[PDB]
Design a protein around this motif. Structure first.
Motif, PDB file in Angstrom:
ATOM      1  N   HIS A   1       3.742   1.811  -1.759  1.00 17.70           N
ATOM      2  CA  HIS A   1       4.077   1.992  -3.162  1.00 17.70           C
ATOM      3  C   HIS A   1       2.834   2.301  -3.987  1.00 17.70           C
ATOM      4  CE1 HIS A   1       7.105  -0.523  -1.227  1.00 17.70           C
ATOM      5  NE2 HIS A   1       7.977  -0.075  -2.113  1.00 17.70           N
TER       6      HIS A   1
ATOM      7  N   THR B   1       0.779  -1.237   0.000  1.00 22.38           N
ATOM      8  CA  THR B   1       0.000   0.000   0.000  1.00 22.38           C
ATOM      9  C   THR B   1       0.816   1.296   0.000  1.00 22.38           C
ATOM     10  OG1 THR B   1      -0.303  -0.248   2.396  1.00 22.38           O
ATOM     11  CG2 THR B   1      -2.080  -1.024   0.974  1.00 22.38           C
TER      12      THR B   1
ATOM     13  N   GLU C   1       9.681  -1.104   4.075  1.00 21.25           N
ATOM     14  CA  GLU C   1       9.925  -1.632   5.409  1.00 21.25           C
ATOM     15  C   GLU C   1      10.433  -3.070   5.322  1.00 21.25           C
ATOM     16  OE1 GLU C   1       6.407  -1.682   7.755  1.00 21.25           O
ATOM     17  OE2 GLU C   1       7.427  -2.227   9.624  1.00 21.25           O
TER      18      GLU C   1
HETATM   19  N1  ATP Z   1      -3.203   5.403   1.288  1.00 22.87           N
HETATM   20  C1  ATP Z   1      -2.163   5.571   2.143  1.00 22.87           C
HETATM   21  N2  ATP Z   1      -1.725   6.804   2.481  1.00 22.87           N
HETATM   22  C2  ATP Z   1      -0.693   6.982   3.327  1.00 22.87           C
HETATM   23  N3  ATP Z   1      -0.016   5.973   3.905  1.00 22.87           N
HETATM   24  C3  ATP Z   1      -0.346   4.683   3.658  1.00 22.87           C
HETATM   25  C4  ATP Z   1      -1.464   4.408   2.741  1.00 22.87           C
HETATM   26  N4  ATP Z   1      -1.580   3.071   2.671  1.00 22.87           N
HETATM   27  C5  ATP Z   1      -0.625   2.535   3.473  1.00 22.87           C
HETATM   28  N5  ATP Z   1       0.114   3.493   4.058  1.00 22.87           N
HETATM   29  C6  ATP Z   1       1.238   3.252   4.997  1.00 22.87           C
HETATM   30  O1  ATP Z   1       1.920   2.039   4.662  1.00 22.87           O
HETATM   31  C7  ATP Z   1       2.148   1.260   5.841  1.00 22.87           C
HETATM   32  C8  ATP Z   1       2.032  -0.230   5.548  1.00 22.87           C
HETATM   33  O2  ATP Z   1       2.370  -0.447   4.185  1.00 22.87           O
HETATM   34  P1  ATP Z   1       2.113  -1.865   3.474  1.00 22.87           P
HETATM   35  O3  ATP Z   1       2.950  -2.937   4.133  1.00 22.87           O
HETATM   36  O4  ATP Z   1       0.618  -2.055   3.391  1.00 22.87           O
HETATM   37  O5  ATP Z   1       2.668  -1.546   1.999  1.00 22.87           O
HETATM   38  P2  ATP Z   1       4.172  -1.910   1.552  1.00 22.87           P
HETATM   39  O6  ATP Z   1       4.429  -1.264   0.212  1.00 22.87           O
HETATM   40  O7  ATP Z   1       4.374  -3.397   1.722  1.00 22.87           O
HETATM   41  O8  ATP Z   1       5.089  -1.140   2.618  1.00 22.87           O
HETATM   42  P3  ATP Z   1       6.582  -1.676   2.863  1.00 22.87           P
HETATM   43  O9  ATP Z   1       7.101  -1.973   1.477  1.00 22.87           O
HETATM   44  O10 ATP Z   1       7.276  -0.527   3.548  1.00 22.87           O
HETATM   45  O11 ATP Z   1       6.373  -2.895   3.727  1.00 22.87           O
HETATM   46  C9  ATP Z   1       1.118   1.702   6.862  1.00 22.87           C
HETATM   47  O12 ATP Z   1       1.707   1.777   8.162  1.00 22.87           O
HETATM   48  C10 ATP Z   1       0.663   3.070   6.393  1.00 22.87           C
HETATM   49  O13 ATP Z   1       1.183   4.078   7.262  1.00 22.87           O
END
Ligand code: ATP
Ligand code: MG
Length: 159
Positions: free
Chosen positions: A106, A104, A125
Motif C-alpha cells: 500500500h 509496504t 495478502e
Molecule cells: N517498493 C516496493 N515495490 C514493489 N513491491 C513491493 C515494494 N514493497 C513491498 N512490495 C511487495 O509487498 C510484499 C510484502 O508486502 P508487505 O506485507 O510488506 O505490505 P502489506 O501492505 O502488508 O502487504 P499485504 O497487505 O498484501 O500483506 C512483498 O512480497 C513485495 O513483493
C-alpha cells in the motif's frame, strides 16, 4: 473512429481484467500490486521489473501474483494495452497519514500515486481487502461497485 471504438474496447477489457483478477486474488488472499500508466512516468519503473510485454488477461495477472515465481516480487505495470512488466519497483511513500495496519504494498502504491498520475490497485495478502491509489490519495477496502466506478472514470476515455 474505428480506432476510437477499438481503444474503448481495449480499455474496457483492461478494466474487466483488473476487476476479475483482483476479485479472485481477494478471495484467495493473494497479495497484488497493479499500476496502470497514464503518462510517461512509469517508464523508469517498468525497467526495474521483469519484461513481459504481454497481452492483458485476468489469468495472466492472477498467475503473476502466485507466490512461487520471481514475477510476484513487486508491481505489475500496465502500459498502453500491455502488461509491460512484473516485479517492478515502486517508491514507498513517506506519508505518516497512512494506516499502520497497511504495509509496504500500500505504501508503494501511495508513493507511485504521489509522483505519477497512474492508477494503482492493491490486494492485501492479509485481509483480502482491495485498495486504490491516485494523486496521493488512498481509497481503502473499496467495494466492487466502487472499484468499477473509479476504473471506469479514470482509465476509460469517455470520448
Ligand atoms: N517498493 C516496493 N515495490 C514493489 N513491491 C513491493 C515494494 N514493497 C513491498 N512490495 C511487495 O509487498 C510484499 C510484502 O508486502 P508487505 O506485507 O510488506 O505490505 P502489506 O501492505 O502488508 O502487504 P499485504 O497487505 O498484501 O500483506 C512483498 O512480497 C513485495 O513483493
Ligand atoms: Mg505485511
Amino acid at each position: 473512429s474505428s480506432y476510437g471504438s477499438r481503444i474503448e474496447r481495449e480499455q474496457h477489457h483492461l478494466i474487466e481484467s483488473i476487476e476479475k483478477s483482483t476479485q479472485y486474488m481477494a478471495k484467495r488472499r493473494i497479495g497484488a500490486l497493479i499500476s496502470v500508466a497514464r503518462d510517461t512516468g512509469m517508464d523508469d519503473y517498468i525497467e526495474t521489473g521483469i519484461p513481459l510485454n504481454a497481452k492483458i488477461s485476468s489469468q495472466l495477472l492472477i498467475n503473476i501474483f502466485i507466490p512461487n515465481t520471481p514475477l510476484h516480487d513487486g508491481a505489475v505495470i500496465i502500459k498502453g494495452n500491455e502488461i509491460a512488466s512484473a516485479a517492478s519497483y515502486l517508491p514507498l511513500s513517506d506519508s505518516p497519514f497512512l494506516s499502520k495496519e497497511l504495509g509496504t504494498r500500500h505504501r508503494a502504491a501511495l508513493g507511485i500515486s504521489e509522483v505519477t498520475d497512474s492508477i494503482t490497485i492493491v490486494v492485501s495478502e492479509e485481509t483480502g481487502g482491495i485498495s486504490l491509489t491516485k494523486g496521493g490519495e488512498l481509497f481503502r477496502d473499496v467495494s466492487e461497485e466502487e472499484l468499477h466506478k473509479i476504473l471506469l472514470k479514470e482509465l476509460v476515455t469517455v470520448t
